[PDB]
């Protein structure tokens, strides 16, 4: 994906296809899936005796073949499906029958010895692929953040909540969905988080229109919203409805791919904003606040585009788009003045190992005063504050060193200090291995490492900050005699201020 | 993943950090002078990331006739009790020993001031038969109903001890 148009545009395009410079050689019995749940897709090979994978790293390289530690022989079974059943967010291996399931937990290096889970009571599960008249699939139709088992037929939607480790609860009827009996072809049923929220909506595709049933938080369906196709577009069995966030809007758009003689595509945008976010506040005393949001993925495209234009190779460490706050605006009803803060983000990252978001390494805050018309001749120039934070992923933190305002006649910058606590002394430490190094760096996440304040003036010294602030943090290992991760404590040891007042000297 | 409830699980603190066992367990039956009626294994906990050095204890009875609880010892001597009485617990409505959450129930200051939190359990009211029909239990949810504070008299003990419901 590339930024289409100028930087700051929200438009998205794709570049001319290029061969990837490197691919795995073994592609006869393999597929691309995140097997570890690390955020890195794995080319996973499960061939005639050979089991392992190649992960796709963020810098574009591939790892060498990594053997799996354990794989069920049933991985390749015709009814094998993967699903999040342990609730770990990992894809577990499961086989489903009507009375029991067989579950192999994903241990993120292979799978665990599986277990046969007997369903309690009289709970009978649907079996995927068993009946062409209905759809059996995993989906968050209850809007709870998990993979529930849902069966969609012409007259009703039934769902068995996932209680974990292969256990399912009683079927829940989710009324409101209804198709004309014999016309109900499951091939026409697609599921989606169209409002960007928990519950997954049911989209029924007809030849000339979409019949969309909004999901009322797992309590049944809304009367369908009918959308019509543009003239000349008709849907059929050779066509496909694809859903994806391809705009940087969070909410996936509906793409109709019609491969006929000259393959063409259409996209239906239902929203330009994620619909449940807080938009406005008004205190009825003249203060009005407007929030705006922008997907993190659009900041990435701007970051990427800027790097391309300077010959640099940007790396995104966040494959899981979030909506960040952008362009907060405060309106003074009564004075007529407005104040807008635009945040720009860069270098954010996903932890991978603990499956958590570490945060944005860089946050840049503008500050613009819109004085009431006729008030003043553009007085009070806009300000800019740059803030660099630790992510605790020293592939990013180490790189922030080049983005700082430079002054050669300056004190040495800071690096984090790692210590322990030995006979009550703050003893310097170099981590023994990667597991410790990881946890020591994890402890740094979110700390401000540096900030700079600039005026966005038209002066000859507009690029020189008024102030520069540097910090040095420290992580102390207090108790390693524990479950593998040690107890760490962290704080700021050094804080250095510089006052330039835009004068470099 | 979904908790096993077999002590292989970990817990999150008052801040969503992982708690770890820091101290060897000890046996105790008396809490702030209150004889709880059972011997509890008391396990000390710390956050993996040490926010303000708060210390936590998990009290686990050796008997099936009692439920567990958590205590928090704040750096200022403030002491908190979470999840002791059943209204303070979120637990599997069937296997009720599977407590998912321990909600703050009581708190005592270092100077004798107290707070007691009265929770109300969810129930089958305020709705249509259809709501109940497809969701027969799920009464594990707890809502804060009344927070009682400003004890008329002074006490160094937690107000929730002995399971005594507050009077206004």
């Amino acid at each position: 994906a590339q930024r289409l148009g100028e930087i700051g545009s929200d438009a998205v395009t794709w570049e001319k296809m290029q061969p990837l410079s490197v691919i795995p050689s073994l592609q006869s019995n393999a597929s691309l899936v995140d097997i570890n749940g690390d955020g890195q897709l794995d080319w996973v090979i499960t061939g005639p005796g050979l089991r392992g994978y190649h992960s796709q790293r963020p810098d574009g390289s591939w790892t060498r073949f990594t053997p799996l530690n354990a794989l069920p022989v049933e991985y390749t079974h015709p009814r094998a499906q993967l699903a999040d059943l342990m609730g770990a967010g990992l894809s577990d291996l499961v086989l489903i029958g009507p009375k029991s399931v067989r579950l192999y937990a994903n241990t993120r290096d292979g799978f665990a010895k599986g277990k046969d889970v007997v369903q309690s009571g009289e709970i009978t599960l649907p079996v995927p692929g068993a009946d062409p008249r209905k759809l059996v699939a995993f989906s968050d139709v209850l809007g709870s953040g998990q993979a529930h088992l849902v069966e969609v037929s012409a007259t009703k939607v039934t769902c068995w909540p996932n209680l974990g480790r292969g256990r399912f609860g009683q079927p829940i009827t989710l009324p409101g969905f209804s198709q004309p009996a014999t016309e109900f072809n499951p091939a026409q049923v697609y599921l989606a988080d169209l409002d960007g929220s928990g519950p997954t909506d049911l989209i029924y595709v007809h030849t000339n229109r979409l019949d969309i049933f909004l999901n009322k938080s797992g309590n049944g369906f809304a009367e369908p919203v009918t959308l019509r196709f543009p003239e000349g577009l008709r849907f059929d069995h050779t066509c496909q409805l694809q859903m994806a966030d391809v705009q940087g809007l969070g909410v996936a758009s509906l793409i109709l791919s019609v491969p006929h003689m000259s393959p063409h595509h259409w996209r239906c945008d239902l929203t330009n904003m994620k619909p449940w976010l807080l938009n406005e506040m008004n205190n009825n005393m003249g203060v009005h606040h407007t929030l705006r949001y922008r997907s993190s993925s659009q900041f990435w495209l701007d970051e990427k585009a800027a790097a391309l234009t300077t010959g640099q190779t940007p790396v995104c460490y966040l494959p899981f788009p979030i909506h960040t706050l952008w362009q907060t605006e405060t309106e003074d009803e009564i004075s007529g003045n407005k104040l807008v803060t635009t945040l720009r983000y860069a270098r954010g990252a996903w932890d991978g190992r603990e499956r958590e978001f570490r945060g944005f390494g860089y946050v840049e805050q503008t500050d613009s005063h819109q004085l009431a018309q006729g008030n003043a001749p553009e007085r009070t120039p806009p300000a800019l504050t740059k803030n660099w934070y630790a992510t605790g992923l020293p592939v990013i933190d180490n790189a922030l060193s080049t983005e700082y305002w430079r002054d050669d006649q300056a004190f040495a910058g800071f690096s984090p200090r790692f210590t322990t606590w030995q006979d009550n002394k703050d003893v310097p430490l170099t981590p023994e291995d990667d597991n410790s190094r990881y946890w020591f760096n994890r402890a740094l996440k979110g700390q401000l490492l540096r900030s700079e304040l600039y005026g966005l003036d038209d002066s000859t010294n507009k690029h020189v900050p008024y102030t520069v602030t540097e910090f040095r943090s420290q992580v102390r290992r207090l108790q390693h005699t524990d479950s593998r991760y040690p107890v760490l404590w962290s704080s700021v040891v050094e804080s250095r201020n510089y006052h330039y007042e835009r004068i470099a000297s | 993943g979904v908790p096993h409830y077999d002590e292989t699980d970990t817990f999150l603190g008052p801040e969503g950090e992982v708690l770890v066992v820091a101290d060897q367990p000890r046996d105790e039956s008396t809490l702030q002078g209150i004889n709880l009626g059972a011997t509890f294994t008391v396990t000390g906990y710390r956050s993996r990331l040490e926010s303000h050095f708060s210390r936590l204890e998990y009290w686990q009875p050796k008997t099936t006739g009692k439920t567990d609880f958590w205590l928090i010892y704040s750096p200022d001597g403030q002491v908190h009790l979470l999840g002791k009485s059943p209204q303070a617990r979120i637990s599997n409505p069937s296997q009720t020993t599977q407590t998912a959450q321990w909600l703050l129930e009581a708190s005592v200051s270092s100077r004798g001031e107290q707070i007691y939190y009265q929770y109300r359990a969810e129930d089958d009211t305020g709705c249509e038969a259809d709501e109940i029909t497809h969701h027969l239990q799920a009464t594990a949810q707890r809502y804060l109903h009344i927070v009682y504070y400003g004890n008329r008299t002074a006490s160094e003990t937690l107000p929730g001890l002995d399971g005594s419901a507050p009077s206004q």
Binding site: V33, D34, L82, S91, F138, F320 | -
Partner: peptide
């Protein structure tokens, strides 16, 4: 204080 969980969607291939 506060809390956050980042929710991502994982898609199986079968």
């Amino acid at each position: 204080n506060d809390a956050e969980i980042s929710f991502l969607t994982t898609i199986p291939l079968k």
